Amino acid sequence: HIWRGMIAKGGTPVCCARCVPMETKLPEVVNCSARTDLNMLAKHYAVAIGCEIVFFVPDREEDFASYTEFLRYLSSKDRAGVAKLDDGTTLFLVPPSDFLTDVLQVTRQERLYGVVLKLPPPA
């Protein structure tokens, strides 16, 4: 049982997608309801105590051109997308860039990363 669903931008479908791990349940639709500057995410990362990652791949070939285009839509502007898991956790949609190696310090891949940051809990 793999995750298979849709990605959307502002409620507007972008493509269908699947998901390989490196986590809670992904909704049927991962909607990118907003963007965040990579700088802003860098600040949350600096203090995070968990950083979980999945890769989103286009589901089928007909989803490729859109997936690719959605990557440039994010990386152009040095931004990341914002979506949610089922349980309300913030999920960031991070396209390929230096940010992946300099800040998250992970291997870089020409893939969209889903990223959840766990910040410190209260005392």
From Swiss-Prot:
It is found in: Nucleus. Expressed in roots, leaves, stems and flowers. Highest expression in flower stems and meristematic regions. Disruption phenotype: Late flowering. It comes from the Eukaryota. Induction: Negative feedback mediated by FPA itself. Residues 3-95 form the SPOC domain. Belongs to the RRM Spen family. Plays a role in the regulation of flowering time in the autonomous flowering pathway by decreasing FLOWERING LOCUS C mRNA levels. Required for RNA-mediated chromatin silencing of a range of loci in the genome. Cotranscriptionally recognizes aberrant RNA and marks it for silencing. Controls alternative cleavage and polyadenylation on pre-mRNAs and antisense RNAs. Acts redundantly with FCA to prevent the expression of distally polyadenylated antisense RNAs at the FLC locus. While FCA requires both FY and FLD, FPA requires FLD but not FY to repress FLC. This is Flowering time control protein FPA. It comes from Arabidopsis thaliana. The lineage of its organism: Eukaryota, Viridiplantae, Streptophyta, Embryophyta, Tracheophyta. The chain holds residues 439 to 565 of 901 of the full protein.
